[PDB]
Design a protein around this ligand. Structure first.
Ligand code: NA
Length: 129
């Protein structure tokens, strides 16, 4: 599924992502925009042989099982395929553990380089929430 900006804002809020670990809804929408372009089925292979999955490009090295990432953990206890669902619940649950891991949203390199310190409220601007 390819979410609309305000539609994804609403979905993230309904799953309690807004202000989770102190990150405003804008931060999550901006991260999604530049990780997946709001596409739930986005997959990207890393040079290390891990793969990133879904709206928030969660990596098979630590967080999900894809059966082809040697030496890897599955700390969200889910197949990486569940992160490609049109229902964002599995992605949200697992992003909650990632952003709790110690480095906050710096875990998403695209968030650090493209959203951190920017006017992230523009991402939820005009959205009925
Ligand atoms: Na894994």
């Amino acid at each position: 599924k390819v979410f609309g900006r305000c539609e994804l804002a609403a979905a993230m809020k309904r799953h309690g992502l807004d202000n989770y670990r102190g990150y405003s809804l804008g931060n999550w929408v901006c991260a999604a925009k530049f990780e997946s372009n709001f596409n739930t089925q986005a997959t990207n292979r890393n040079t290390d042989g891990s793969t990133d999955y879904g709206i928030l490009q969660i990596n098979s090295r630590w967080w999900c099982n894809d059966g082809r990432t040697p030496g890897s953990r599955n700390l969200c206890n889910i197949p990486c395929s569940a992160l490609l669902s049109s229902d964002i619940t599995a992605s949200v649950n697992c992003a909650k553990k990632i952003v709790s891991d110690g480095n906050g949203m710096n875990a998403w390199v695209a968030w650090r380089n493209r959203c951190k310190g920017t006017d992230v409220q523009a991402w939820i601007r005009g959205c009925r929430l």
